[PDB]
Design a binder for this molecule. Structure first.
Ligand SMILES: Cc1ccc(Oc2ccc(NC(=O)c3ccccc3C(=O)O)cc2)cc1C
Lengths: 225, 206
């Protein structure tokens, strides 16, 4: 266990839009600066002995053009980042409801996962169309199917069993949740998984969140734990 | 404004220790701070207040008559199934007494965990599936929501935790998806109306 004590960090990346607005730029330039901040945080986590990093691109807590814009942002990010991740020995996984993504994109997600699946460095989980409540409900559906098959008794369902059906159950528990951008809310990111996690909120905007900020959040966890 | 506030009330043990007093004394100052927080929420039009003691039937019993007079609806949330049956009966009686009240709903967590709360709703749905009254593909967020604690109340708008720790500690999980989280180093027994107003400000600012 590294000195900072963290095996699994999750990050709500917020502030890309406010960052571009401060500079008189459109939202697109915030997205580009955001991506650069993702690469820097990935490389920092990998160099600092963290087992798993899970990232959530915050957009809002709420239309056609919205989803579509977010879908395109995911498409662009996946296409652009997967080779670099593979080359940094990162194992990539996507968590979230990808069921209604079109078959071609679902294929691209699957190939990106299979490519990096034997990587031994950081495990990087990227939330895409993810919500904490959906994650719980899909695990509940898996249990309900087992009941309907006659394989599972309602009274055998306990916390440990539902734990084994939510996303990331096979990785170290989430030790620390960082939210940048100044809001003090989880916004339907991980819920079940953050029952015992340290919550660390910083006003720094995502594109500005750098290695010293990440180091500060790890050290705060080391000191508070 | 803020309709439903939940508070993790931590710092009683540490407060006692700063005072050079035994744990018991801190419990007793924490109970005075409960009374103050309940009055403040009821005087300020908050619809629901949900309190979790992070570090009982007698305390409830001696306070229920006054809560009832103040039109407070008292509910206990959590697994009371292993409390002795006399105490279970007294909890049920206090709830039934105040159940018709239309002012502040005061939810007191007792042996509560946010994971436990979700699991109890899941077990209920699992029962319905096994009886053939429910298809697994029919299970959605609104449905599970209807089987977790407090689903008849306004969504939790704000969670306050006193005592300096920055964690939810398996208090509400499902219900805090969109809540403002407000952490204060103030120890629970010291937490007063000014501290409670500062938390409501953080909500109003956002
Ligand atoms: C390596 C890497 C790093 C960061 C990264 O950031 C993201 C993550 C997710 C989205 N979009 C959705 O999550 C989404 C997709 C469809 C519909 C709704 C949504 C929704 O945001 O709600 C955009 C950008 C992606 C990758 C691939």
């Amino acid at each position: 266990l590294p000195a900072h004590g963290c095996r699994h960090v999750a990050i709500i990346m917020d502030g890309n839009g406010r960052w571009a607005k401060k500079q008189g730029k459109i939202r697109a330039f915030g997205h580009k600066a955001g991506a650069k901040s993702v690469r820097r945080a990935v490389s920092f986590a990998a160099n600092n002995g963290i087992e798993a990093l899970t990232l959530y691109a915050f957009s809002s807590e709420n239309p056609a053009q919205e989803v579509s814009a977010l879908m395109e942002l995911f498409v662009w990010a996946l296409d652009s980042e997967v080779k670099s991740l593979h080359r940094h020995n990162v194992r990539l996984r996507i968590i979230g409801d990808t069921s209604r993504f079109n078959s071609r994109l679902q294929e691209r997600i699957r190939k990106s996962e299979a490519l990096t699946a034997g990587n031994t460095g950081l495990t990087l989980n990227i939330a895409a169309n993810y919500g904490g409540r959906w994650d719980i409900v899909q695990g509940v559906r898996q249990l309900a199917e087992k009941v309907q098959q006659g394989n599972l008794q309602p009274d055998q369902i306990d916390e440990e069993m539902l734990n084994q059906h939510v996303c990331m159950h096979e990785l170290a528990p989430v030790d620390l949740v960082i939210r940048t951008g100044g809001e003090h809310r989880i916004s339907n990111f991980l819920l079940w998984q953050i029952a015992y996690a340290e919550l660390y909120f910083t006003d720094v905007l995502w594109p500005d969140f750098d290695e010293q900020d990440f180091e500060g959040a790890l050290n705060a966890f080391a000191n508070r734990e």
